[PDB]
């Protein structure tokens, strides 16, 4: 691109900044929420996350077909 | 962007309107009307006056007695602790007599208060129906509203009076409470085998969904053509303008057939009434001629069948 | 409020929606509260016999001395670790019976050995077993017992209804809040639904379905499951469309009735008054006393197989 | 902060900010006091301190 | 075909996509570009439903009874992937076809109202029902984690799905958004009955009487309940209630499971555990 | 007297069949009521048959219903005859179902979105016989609500944000107090035109009225009244239709498409 | 307290104050009587005294 | 603290603040009394002090 400044001759900058800010904030919220759901990248669990080990023949979830 | 006519941008104030004069032998209307600014952004900004005759006074007295009895029993159920009354308010209730009495009169603490409250509430509702009929006839109008109210009252009486008398016990009736009457609704379905398979329940649900659909369509249609004066429906009915023509043509192009400005209000009237009519029948057939709706549906080939992937051994069949 | 996603276990046919949903954080917190205890080392096999060195042994007559002392050491940990051995035995000797705790424990031993041999269609499907630690969890008094509930206070001339009052015993619904007495102690009919399409002599009232509903709410709260763990909701009466856990629950109800009627009530004379309810009945066993919010006690940890003193033979 | 901060009131009127702050701090204080009352570590009424001097009958252990 | 006063309104233009390529009428219907796309999406969806009925769940339980025909979603072990055609992929294809048809219908309505010169309230209101369907079959399955959480396509089987989903929370009446949505539905039905009754009563007076005016409409409800809302405001309120019912129903179903995994009565414990009592 | 009529039939089945019969009757009744306006239809089948086959579908039409209008305004039949008209357009293509082209100048054409019927030429009346929609210069007892802009003297701007006049008077409704029209004093012909509220947006910050239907130069062709104190059902329809035509004919980009 | 307190009555409407205080006092009396009735020590009807 | 605070009444209407203060204080007193009555330690009616002439 060389003459990209003409793109502001068709789109109003005042609306463009509002739209860009809103879209970027929404994208950031969505990505943070997606990481929070994932089981690998969840910093709320704490650095010292130690799940409970099962000493005997026990299972946290019941069996299902 | 464009004015959607959802809120009133600029309001205009004229003197209060007492109402069309009533004929001779009527009491004057009570109260002086006043105007509310925030209420005028969505509708008419005038409250009052009201007409109160003799039927209207009797309805008020009967209904207040019934509500006072219900509240007094709710307060007595927590041993006069007003704070605990506020805490448990949604869970409290006044409940029907025990099943071991049939249709007799039990003591007060064991269902007499429930019977008295039900009688007084029914009297107030009947008197209010008479009031609506009289007010419709005083202005020279017809009686569609009283017929629709009569259908609602029919369903109410089937729910509370007719079916218990047919079954022969007061314990089949619904309690007076917020969470208690939802519990009654759930237990009624559980006891009679999955009310989803009652065909009149299906028809009633269809008519309720249809009422919601029809009101959404009619409201959106009238709001869309209100730039042509479409909200003045009486003039369009007696003299068809562009609003009625465009409203009909939109739906004819969309789904192939249409109604009229006068006729659509009939589709609205019958759809709502049939919601309660089919309801009142649906519970009068339950427990009297049908014992288990799921087995009835299986008998008539309605219930679907699934592959057997989970099953249990019957300990009563060993 | 909680945040997604949950852990889901499918139980039925696809599209029928018979599933269990768990919050992983709540599941981990609940797991932290139900850990088992590491068993003692096995005893040396052989030597002197019990019936030749002890006098007042009545229940554990067919053991070895090493196994007997190992069992005593273990039950010290399972029931009364703080007080030690003086909780049950009078100081000075061991053959005396002049204290109520020893008699109660002697009856409890028989209850456990009966549970592990006579009700294997409930407590031995996967070999989990029942030990003293299943109920007490290290406490002299179990944490999840019940008595006949009087309910909120009423005026002197008002007849109680037993409902229309928020209560955790039915998981905060406005249902009858005392389902223990008519079902888990007495023997009343739980079935309310008719089994024909047309009426034929089934005069169950609508108010009895609410009692059944309250008992089912209590059961599902005790096991930490929902209704579709045992039922298909379009036919609650239909055993052909239910799950295999429904049969286990059917037997468990009878097992609990047997425990209450034949092991707990006869002890009401010797227990102190601090173990009795306002009506004068002792603390009784329910579904919550063992499961404590899990579909299996301790999520199925197996510690009963290491102690042969908890089996009738 | 900057010496010229007093110009802030040329954009916001005193009445609508005074009312908001006075109606806001009260709500925040109520919420914090209730949150502390909800916990078993920071409840000053039922902490058992100092002593009880109130006798605390058969009980219902289901609740 | 055409009403006796319709020929004045069949003008060219106002299309969104297509221009003069698909700008014509077929009988009473206006088709356009979105008419073609929606009609053929619907046709393929119908044909695949019929084929799924022909195959049946098995070779023994297959039946052409209309109450018993059901096309079911995949298993929960497939996650959000694509299932084999016979094991639940037909459901996914039919879901895609249904979404396409609904969106095409809404866009055709937009074109029609651009042509007639009227407002856009009707497609806007239809978008709410479309969004409720999308929450039912798209948003909730993704939040939960598998396509198997959608409901089956059958006249009687989706009732079984509703019942079992409801009993997964042990008492569904205690859902608060559910209570709000039900209140809105009942109020909408009452308001519709009253609007129809009043218009018919005014338009069809007693025998030997003239048509009533606008003052009678306001006087009637001021003499019954002491307040009258007006001719335009009753339609405003009807639209508002009908859309609020659907919005709160969508909220109520999207919080069951994704945001709450216990019984619904227990949710009220925050009220019962306040320090006031 | 029991619940089983035969080995297969029971009461709850006969009841549902009776409901279906009643519902079929009700649907026929409602569809017959729907057909009081616009039937018999205008199609090629009628004109090919030389006005012999009349297209009404099923069910056929009902007997005429009479409305009597107050203040001796007359009597109107719900199913009536109306005179066939000659439209101001020309078909784009000769195949059936083809669109028409708005011959002439589209704004001043009376076809498409800028079309209207011919209503009765009398003013709507109140319960006492007065005209219903009148300017505030004769409804002196009216007033503007407090803390409200009072849109007198506000400048009206056209579609392109160019001023086309100022507001001179407000037309209100005696029976229901609300604004139905604005009066614009056009500064291009020294005339006054009416503007419906449904086509105007109130910019209360800077005190402006936005008209997105027609441009500023189009305010010179709005149909005029007969007398400066009242309006008839005919003129109101004409005025509204002229503005509605601008939603399609105002600019070259409003006919479509997007792609 | 300053003697000039009587200027309160030109700042608030006396009729509204009168009715508000009457209603508040009646509601307060009812609430206190009921709270006393809910107890065991202060229920004068079911106390059994005199027998 | 400030000898010029009396200007506050030139901004906020005194007639409104009097009502908003009286109502708030009444509600606060009721709430604090209820909180005290909801405890086993500061419930002055059911504390059993002094004595108990009735049986329960
Ligand atoms: C086998 C199969 C069986 C079926 C076979 C036939 C199938 C084909 C049927 C084709 C036709 C279909 C219907 C279309 C006809 C039509 O729309 O007429 C146009 C006609 C147009 O009228 P219009 O042009 O507006 O007339 C204006 C005139 O100025 C004034 O007009 P008018 O006054 O001359 O009109 C006469 C008017 C009568 O007018 C008068 O008598 C004078 C004014 C009224 C005085 C009486 C007061 C009303 C009585 C109720 C009192 C309530 C007391 C308190 C409440 C108690 C509640 C229990 O008619 C009525 O109002 C009848 C009274 C209805 C009141 C009660 C309705 C709700 C309660 C339901 C009870 C439970 C039902 C369970 C089943 O509309 C009507 O006539 C409506 C009539 C009322 C509607 C409801 C009627 C009952 C419907 C029951 C539906 C469910 C049945 C289920 C059956 C299957 C399942 C078992
Ligand atoms: C519990 C309730 C459960 C309800 C279950 C059922 C619910 C679903 C029902 C489905 C109904 C579908 C209707 C299709 C309409 C098609 C358009 C049409 O012509 O309408 C015929 C008919 C009127 O016909 P017409 O205007 O007299 O005919 C004009 C001449 O015949 C003109 O003469 P012609 O020579 O033109 O005659 C040919 C005639 C052909 O007529 C038919 O095909 C038969 C139609 C009826 C079957 O018309 C056509 O040419 C149609 C051409 C279609 C072309 C299709 C292919 C391209 C379309 C592309 C579209 C864009 C994509 O409209 C209706 O019958 C509507 C009845 C609605 C009943 C609803 C009942 C339940 C409502 C819920 C209850 C709510 C509470 C109520 C209180
Ligand atoms: C045991 C079961 C539980 C219960 C479990 C559930 C569950 C589960 C659900 C509900 C839902 C609802 N429940 Mg509930 N509910 C119970 C008891 C009740 C009771 C009662 C009297 O007890 C009432 C009144 C209700 C009412 C409601 C509504 C609030 C809601 C359904 C309306 C809706 O979602 O619109 C939505 C409308 C649509 C989705 C329409 C979509 C149509 C679109 C436009 C597609 C076009 C259609 C078609 C293809 C067009 C062509 C057709 C023909 C060819 C012409 N429930 C019991 C206690 N309830 C549902 C809900 O909230 O969903 C959001 C829901 O999922
Ligand atoms: C530990 C629990 C103690 C207890 C400890 C306390 C303590 C500590 C306090 C109270 C206070 C109050 N308690 Mg206490 N209280 C107990 C038991 C009771 C019982 C009972 C049934 O046993 C009752 C009816 C009360 C009632 C009261 C009120 C009199 C008072 C709160 C008033 C208010 O809400 O102001 C809200 C309403 C307003 C503020 C309106 C404004 C009033 C006007 C503008 C100013 C005063 C003018 C006045 C109306 C008339 C002239 C009065 C002059 C100043 C002389 N307490 C038990 C025994 N109670 C408070 C108090 O003393 O207040 C005076 C207080 O500090
Ligand atoms: C077509 C079926 C639908 C329908 C129709 C319908 N309802 C109707 C009507 C019709 C046609 C009427 O004409 C009638 C009416 O008046 O409408 C305005 C009515 C009505 N529907 C009502 C309710 C209602 N309708 C419902 C449902 C439905 N109504 C259906 C969906 C429901 C539901 C879903 O539960 C309710 C709750 C009423 C508002 C009204 C009939 C009122 C009536 O008959 O009241 C009689 C009794 C009294 C007035 C007792 C009053 C006693 C004292 C005044 C009490 C004092 C204490 C007070 C309450 C304390 C609180 C402060 C107060 C100031 C509020
Ligand atoms: C949001 C408020 C309410 C509402 C509004 C509303 N509905 C609307 C509109 C509006 C404003 C229209 O403009 C539009 C219309 O054209 O109305 C005549 C419509 C409409 N609402 C309809 C139905 C409908 N609305 C419902 C609900 C509601 N609609 C709400 C209560 C329901 C319910 C509650 O069940 C139904 C069934 C249609 C009659 C129509 C839209 C027609 C349409 O989209 O046509 C295109 C599609 C086809 C012709 C064929 C689709 C092909 C598919 C393969 C079909 C099967 C899909 C399905 C997922 C599988 C089977 C499901 C099983 C359960 C059987
Ligand atoms: C069952 C059908 C029974 C006959 C239906 C019928 O006869 O409808 C016919 C439709 O034929 C036609 O589209 C024939 C062309 C079919 C087009 C189908 C389009 C499918 C995709 C949309 C006639 O309609 P039109 O030619 O548009 O109108 C004729 C005039 O009145 C002008 O309006
Ligand atoms: C300050 O306020 C005071 C304290 C004064 C009063 C406050 C009272 C309050 C807070 C009341 C709250 C009431 C609530 C929450 C009520 C909820 C009611 C609900 C949800 C009711 C729902 C359904 C109830 C039904 C359908 C009951 C119907 C019963 C009927 C139809 C029974 C009729 C019975 C008859 C006619 C019996 C006749 C037999 C005879 C005549 C012999 O009986 C004497
Ligand atoms: C394993 C073999 C044991 C032992 C050694 C004991 N128990 Fe139990 N127990 C249960 C219940 C409901 C009670 C009544 C509540 C109570 O009295 O506290 C008891 C009581 C006892 C006592 C008496 C304690 C006391 O209060 O003085 C003792 C000494 C005792 N147990 C020992 C319930 C259960 C079980 C649930 C079904 C099981 C299993 C056991 N107990 C097992 C044991
Ligand atoms: C009325 C709305 C009350 C909201 C606050 C209470 C519930 C808070 C979230 C609890 C979990 O989820
Ligand atoms: Ca303390
Ligand atoms: Ca006394
Ligand atoms: Ca004391
Ligand atoms: Fe209308
Ligand atoms: Mg109950």
Numbering used by the authors:
A (entry chain 3): 2 to 66
B (entry chain M): 1 to 318
C (entry chain C): 23 to 335
D (entry chain Y): 1 to 56, 58 to 64
E (entry chain L): 1 to 277
F (entry chain H): 1 to 259
G (entry chain U): 1 to 51
H (entry chain W): 1 to 56
What's the publication's text?
The core light-harvesting (LH1) complex from A. tepidum exhibits an absorption maximum at 890 nm and mildly enhanced thermostability, both of which are Ca2+-dependent. The RC has a tetraheme-cytochrome subunit and contains four BChls a, two bacteriopheophytins a, one 15-cis-spirilloxanthin, a menaquinone (MQ)-8 at the QA site, and a ubiquinone (UQ)-8 at the QB site.
The arrangement is characterized by specific interactions between the shortest LH1 α2-polypeptides and the RC L- and M-subunits in the transmembrane region. Although A. tepidum LH1 α1- and α3-polypeptides have no significant interactions with the RC subunits in the transmembrane region, these polypeptides have longer chain lengths and are able to interact with the RC C-subunit through their membrane-extruded C-terminal regions.
